[PDB]
Amino acid sequence: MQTFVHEAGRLPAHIAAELGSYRYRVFVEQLGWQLPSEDEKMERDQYDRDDTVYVLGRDANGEICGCARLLPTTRPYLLQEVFPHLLADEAPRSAHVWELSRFAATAWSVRPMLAAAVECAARRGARQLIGVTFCSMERMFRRIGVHAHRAGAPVSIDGRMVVACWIDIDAQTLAALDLDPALC
Numbered sequence: 001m002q003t004f005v006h007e008a009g010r011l012p013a014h015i016a017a018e019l020g021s022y023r024y025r026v027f028v029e030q031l032g033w034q035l036p037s038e039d040e041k042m043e044r045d046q047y048d049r050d051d052t053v054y055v056l057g058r059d060a061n062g063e064i065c066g067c068a069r070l071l072p073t074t075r076p077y078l079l080q081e082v083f084p085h086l087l088a089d090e091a092p093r094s095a096h097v098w099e100l101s102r103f104a105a106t107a108w109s110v111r112p113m114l115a116a117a118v119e120c121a122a123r124r125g126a127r128q129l130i131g132v133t134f135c136s137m138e139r140m141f142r143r144i145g146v147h148a149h150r151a152g153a154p155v156s157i158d159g160r161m162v163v164a165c166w167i168d169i170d171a172q173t174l175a176a177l178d179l180d181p182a183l184c
């Protein structure tokens, strides 16, 4: 796949609709996070703002096959406000930490999506990423080789095993993702 990072403020209308539809299909239809909706397929919450950073992966036909959301911890974020109890410690508010959420890929698919997210966050000054991740996804991160470690004990939410996860943007993570080591 090919990755596209959107960090220019409010998403253009067509991208917002296309991403919203892809998210609806993954998080609502696939994972069943909400009941079926009516009208346009759209999945968005209070964390989708003009300042939100997005990563979209597109296949050979230019269709979305992956997504990711990046938020600075110095501003409101999901783990902080919604799932703070998943953390061993209090939720961080630092320029060096960004939250990765709504991460999905439609194996060697996850890698490019993660690389784009890390690269972007690093260029914005982040030294670590944090976020609630399915343990199955946590295992892929481990296999990919990034330096991921737990920020809390695992818990099964509505039948889905997840855990607050850290990803250190260090030499190991950068190398595993084929990114510029200088980003360290």
Ligand SMILES: CSC[C@H]1O[C@@H](n2cnc3c(N)ncnc32)[C@H](O)[C@@H]1O
Binding pocket: 033, 034, 045, 046, 047, 078, 082, 132, 157, 158, 162
């Ligand atoms: C991220 S772990 C998956 C759980 O997070 C919930 N979730 C995702 N985003 C939000 C949100 N903005 N507010 C409340 N719950 C959320 C989903 O409905 C699912 O049950």
Ligand SMILES: CCCCCCCC(=O)NC1=CC(=O)CCC1
Binding pocket: 026, 100, 101, 102, 103, 104, 105, 129, 130, 131, 132, 133, 134, 136, 137, 165, 166, 167
């Ligand atoms: C610091 C790690 C942050 C990663 C957060 C993962 C985000 C997320 O929404 N998880 C998902 C993983 C899947 O397996 C399918 C779609 C949902």
